[PDB]
């Protein structure tokens, strides 16, 4: 048995692990270290055409500016969104 | 209340989130009250997990 849960939802009480790194888990995890995750979800409830739109928006945020880690925060958001269109 | 007897404000009214634990952790055993029943209670990343657990209980 393998307990798979986010802080809010519990799914299970073979499994895939992305290193944590925003990536797929097939029996999606945003991050973390039983596998502990901050946002762990379906797979069914991800959308998706908005993940592509959120990717294009984050890439438009990047051509600032400027000061390191802002910047880093935008690239994180880009990495997360890339690994969401990759997922579905 | 912890600071007025002896810092974060705005805790308890809305239910605590992991986002609340993150805010605390980013600023930086843990002591909290563990729920038993209606009457009874008792006194890098996994560090934010432990702040969160002490918030939910």
């Amino acid at each position: 048995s393998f307990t798979f849960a986010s802080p809010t939802q519990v799914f299970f009480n073979q499994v895939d692990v992305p290193t944590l790194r925003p990536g797929l888990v097939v029996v999606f995890v945003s991050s973390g270290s039983q596998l502990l995750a901050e946002e762990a979800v379906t797979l069914d409830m991800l959308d998706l055409g908005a993940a592509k739109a959120n990717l294009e928006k984050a890439q438009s945020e990047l051509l600032g500016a400027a000061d390191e880690a802002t910047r880093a925060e935008i690239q994180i958001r880009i990495e997360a969104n890339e690994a969401l269109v990759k997922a579905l | 209340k912890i600071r007025s007897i002896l810092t974060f404000k705005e805790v308890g009214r809305r239910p605590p989130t992991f986002g609340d634990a993150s805010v605390i952790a980013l600023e930086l055993s843990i002591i909290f009250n563990r729920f038993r029943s209606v009457i009874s209670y008792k006194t890098e990343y996994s560090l934010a997990n432990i702040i969160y657990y002490s918030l939910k209980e």
């Binding site: 945003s30 901050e38 880690a69 958001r77 | 980013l26 890098e44 934010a48």
Partner: peptide
Amino acid sequence: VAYWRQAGLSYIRYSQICAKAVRDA
């Protein structure tokens, strides 16, 4: 060493951001 952990940043901020991107999707 990762790009976010250069000037800053903790994995808590990293996690926080990724988590929010999943909720926004």
